[PDB]
């Protein structure tokens, strides 16, 4: 039953490859449905942002080597924006999956019960985030693409100097 979603990535407009995720819909269904729909764009316009609820053309705006890569801010591209398909944010659904390995997909937030559209992919274990961020999926292919994102040189806000853009995205 678990859905599979993908991003086709470019780095400074140069295709880097495809990342495929499996989403743990059995554990975190509301969280997974949000991400799935942001991949397809099927839910249309975000209520507060008035921009498409869609990861197409969205950046990975924050990268920290040996920690994680973060993206999904479709409205501002810098971490300040984003919103969920439900309007505004939604509650933390489950803390059952641990941040105990690389290549886990988890929600970025701005505190308790503030899940929007922003996510991160771990590149090392991040156990201190347990109870703070909801893990809801995992990379199943394209790990090397994630590593290439992780290796980008970044600015003072940890934003890559070279644009890491989701060219295309969807559900498999």
């Amino acid at each position: 039953q678990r859905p599979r979603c993908f991003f086709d990535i470019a780095i400074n407009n140069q295709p880097a490859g495809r990342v495929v995720f499996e989403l743990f819909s059995d554990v975190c269904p509301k969280t997974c449905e949000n991400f799935r729909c942001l991949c397809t764009g099927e839910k249309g316009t975000g209520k507060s942002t008035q921009k498409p609820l869609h990861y197409k053309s969205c950046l990975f705006h924050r990268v920290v080597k040996d920690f994680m890569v973060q993206g999904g801010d479709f409205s501002e591209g810098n971490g300040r924006g984003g919103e969920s398909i439900y309007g505004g944010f939604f509650e933390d659904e489950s803390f059952a999956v641990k941040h105990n390995k690389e290549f886990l997909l988890s929600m970025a937030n701005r505190g308790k019960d503030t899940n929007g559209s922003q996510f991160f992919i771990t590149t090392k274990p991040t156990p201190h985030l347990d109870g703070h961020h909801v893990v809801f999926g995992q990379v199943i292919s394209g790990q090397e693409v994630v590593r290439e994102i992780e290796n980008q040189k970044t600015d003072a806000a940890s934003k890559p100097f070279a644009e890491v853009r989701i060219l295309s995205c969807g559900e498999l």
Binding site: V64, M68, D73, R80, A108, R110, G116, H128, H133
Partner: peptide, 11 residues
Amino acid sequence: XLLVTAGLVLA
């Protein structure tokens, strides 16, 4: 430090 926030990134 090592957080993943959306708006005020901390140490």
